[PDB]
Amino acid sequence: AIEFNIQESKILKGVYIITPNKFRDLRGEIWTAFTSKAVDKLLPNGLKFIHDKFIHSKHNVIRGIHGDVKTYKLATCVYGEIHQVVVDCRKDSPTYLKYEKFIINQDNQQIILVPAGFGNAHYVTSESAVYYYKCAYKGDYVQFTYAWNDERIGIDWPTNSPILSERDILAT
Amino acid sequence: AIEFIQESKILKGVYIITPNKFRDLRGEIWTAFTSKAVDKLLPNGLKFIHDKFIHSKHNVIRGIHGDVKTYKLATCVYGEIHQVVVDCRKDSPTYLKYEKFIINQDNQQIILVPAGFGNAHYVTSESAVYYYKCAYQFTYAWNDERIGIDWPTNSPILSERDI
Ligand SMILES: Nc1nc2c(ncn2[C@@H]2O[C@H](COP(=O)(O)OP(=O)(O)O[C@H]3O[C@H](CO)[C@@H](O)[C@H](O)[C@@H]3O)[C@@H](O)[C@H]2O)c(=O)[nH]1
Numbered sequence: 001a002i003e004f005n006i007q008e009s010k011i012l013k014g015v016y017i018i019t020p021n022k023f024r025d026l027r028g029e030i031w032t033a034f035t036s037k038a039v040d041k042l043l044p045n046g047l048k049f050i051h052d053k054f055i056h057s058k059h060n061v062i063r064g065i066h067g068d069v070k071t072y073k074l075a076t077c078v079y080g081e082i083h084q085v086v087v088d089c090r091k092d093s094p095t096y097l098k099y100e101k102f103i104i105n106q107d108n109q110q111i112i113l114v115p116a117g118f119g120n121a122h123y124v125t126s127e128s129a130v131y132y133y134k135c136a137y138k139g140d141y142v143q144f145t146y147a148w149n150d151e152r153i154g155i156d157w158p159t160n161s162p163i164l165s166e167r168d169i170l171a172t
Numbered sequence: 173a174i175e176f177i178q179e180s181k182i183l184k185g186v187y188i189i190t191p192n193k194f195r196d197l198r199g200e201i202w203t204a205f206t207s208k209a210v211d212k213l214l215p216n217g218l219k220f221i222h223d224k225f226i227h228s229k230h231n232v233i234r235g236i237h238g239d240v241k242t243y244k245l246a247t248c249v250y251g252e253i254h255q256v257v258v259d260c261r262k263d264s265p266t267y268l269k270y271e272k273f274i275i276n277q278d279n280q281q282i283i284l285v286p287a288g289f290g291n292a293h294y295v296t297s298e299s300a301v302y303y304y305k306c307a308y309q310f311t312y313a314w315n316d317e318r319i320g321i322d323w324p325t326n327s328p329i330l331s332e333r334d335i
């Protein structure tokens with residue numbers, strides 16, 4: 001019943017694309033985004049996802065590009081539609097500053113494992129969207145941000161005028 | 173800063189967990205769970221291991237479902253629900269008593285539902301996304317007279333055919 005298609009990315013080594021099964025009917029849908037047994041095994045030895053976060057964002061909002069050298073993330077969209085972007089920011093990688101983009105919605109329920117040393121970002125195409133992500137990292141008690149349109153990455157976003165700040169959304 | 177926890181004053185074992193949120197006109201950012209803050213509430217090193225979502229249309233009811241082993245952590249991450257917890261431990265002094273919570277983005281209560289409790293929710297908004305975690309069997313009718321839950325409707329969608 002509860003199953004995962006787990007595929008390594010075709011272009012960015014370390015990135016996994018995880019698609020769950022869903023029970024769908026006219027009342028709605030039921031699905032499992034994560035189990036420890038199926039998904040924590042993808043992390044390095046003895047690391048586990050320990051944090052669950054949600055970002056509810058309006059139409060045309062961008063979040064990112066954010067990352068660091070320690071935090072692994074697991075990300076999807078549980079309401080509406082996003083364009084989810086992962087950027088390889090490991091300077092020694094053969095795919096350094098290359099990216100992969102995923103259009104995630106209820107009919108394309110990809111869940112992206114974003115490794116340490118990758119930038120993370122998403123853009124909301126629907127009226128609003130709820131972003132869901134899990135976090136895993138060593139060391140609890142104690143980092144890079146790239147501009148959404150950084151020319152060196154050259155991300156093909158579905159807009160040229162996204163909302164980046166509170167002051168931007170007053171205009172719309 | 174990421175912050176959270178109150179024990180229910182009617183059902184022993186039930187916790188009501190409210191996170192803080194950063195809010196602005198673009199929307200909301202918040203943490204529903206950390207292992208350190210929330211897994212400590214479970215017995216004997218048990219941990220939440222499962223994450224599930226239920227997207228349901230307006231007027232749908234789910235429940236009342238439970239068992240004697242599964243602990244749950246439940247909230248609503250889009251829209252609005254009425255979340256209900258029912259003590260179904262036969263030896264409990266509050267057996268078949270319930271507690272109800274109206275959960276939406278301005279009232280982001282996250283309910284820890286212990287083993288031996290029935291779980292249910294009803295969707296008041298156009299649609300809702302229910303989020304719950306599981307750590308690890310009975311089903312009661314939504315309108316069971318012995319429980320007597322004050323639901324905000326008398327004609328909920330209970331099956332596909334009801335649509
Ligand atoms: N309560 C709570 N607050 C949080 C959480 N996560 C982040 N915050 C708080 O929410 C505020 C905004 O968070 P971010 O927007 O993630 O901060 P940032 O990474 O510095 O913002 C950068 O990216 C934005 C686009 O995503 C840019 O618009 C901005 O200029 C900057 O480059 C910060 O004050 C941060 O402390 C959480 O889980 N819970």
Ligand SMILES: Nc1nc2c(ncn2[C@@H]2O[C@H](COP(=O)(O)OP(=O)(O)O)[C@@H](O)[C@H]2O)c(=O)[nH]1
Binds near residue numbers: 032224234
């Ligand atoms: N693929 C998948 N199916 C599930 C999951 N949870 C429950 N189901 C199935 O969805 C169907 C409906 O579940 P049920 O509890 O009977 O309905 P409800 O009372 O309306 O939630 C059943 O046939 C279950 O086996 C899940 O996490 N993933």
